[PDB]
User: Fold Protein KIBRA from Homo sapiens.
Amino acid sequence: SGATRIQIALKYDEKNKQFAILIIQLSNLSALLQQQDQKVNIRVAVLPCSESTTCLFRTRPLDASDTLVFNEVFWVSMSYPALHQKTLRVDVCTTDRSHLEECLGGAQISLAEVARSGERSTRWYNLLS
Amino acid sequence: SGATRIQIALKYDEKNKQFAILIIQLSNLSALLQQQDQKVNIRVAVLPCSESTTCLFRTRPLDASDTLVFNEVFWVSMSYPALHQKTLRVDVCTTDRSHLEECLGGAQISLAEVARSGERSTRWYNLLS
Assistant:
């Protein structure tokens, strides 16, 4: 049925010493989901996790659909040299009133080549189980 | 201190419907490897694994060193559409004196954005322990 993909924009803000992560959307989510009516969120982790900062984020949950748009931004306080040692982990997760994440697949994105300046990069990433 | 990084070149060859993975070198390997007189190899997986074609590759082992150059190229036979669904999993592994193949760290590289054109990308990728 193919790969599920997530589109993510990334941008560093040197003026404020902060990194922006824009979770845009999922495509071909049908490929990753067998059941019906499920709620989906995306868990975002900036790894390895520095203990003097929040490194774990979760989108709001939305009704599963083959294309699914979140458009949520997450800001992380981090210097550029520190940012370049990091990897971004994003996981598509199923959830219910039990409040247990069932994270069915994800991507990992080395941040070593994030630009210090200029425009955001916006790329599609395959999810792996 | 810092991330160990791997430098990898990627290029699709549409004339022969094949994909090239050039494992160039490790950098700052001392971040992940403290033990002495170890030999190190790079394991390379194109996932998910179409059990027809060959998915798993592995460099020769070399004596561990903070900068470590391999320059090995692995060729994968598959059409661009199939390649566009895959993810590349690379790991830095020791070959212990007792034939343990325990792995120190790795990276995950979505291939969704490899150019059919055959434009050669050469990038550094952080490794997560």
Observations:
- Chain A has one domain: 1-129.
- Residues 80-83 of chain A form the longest helix (4 residues).
- DSSP finds one helix and nine strands in chain A.
- The radius of gyration of chain A is 15 Å.
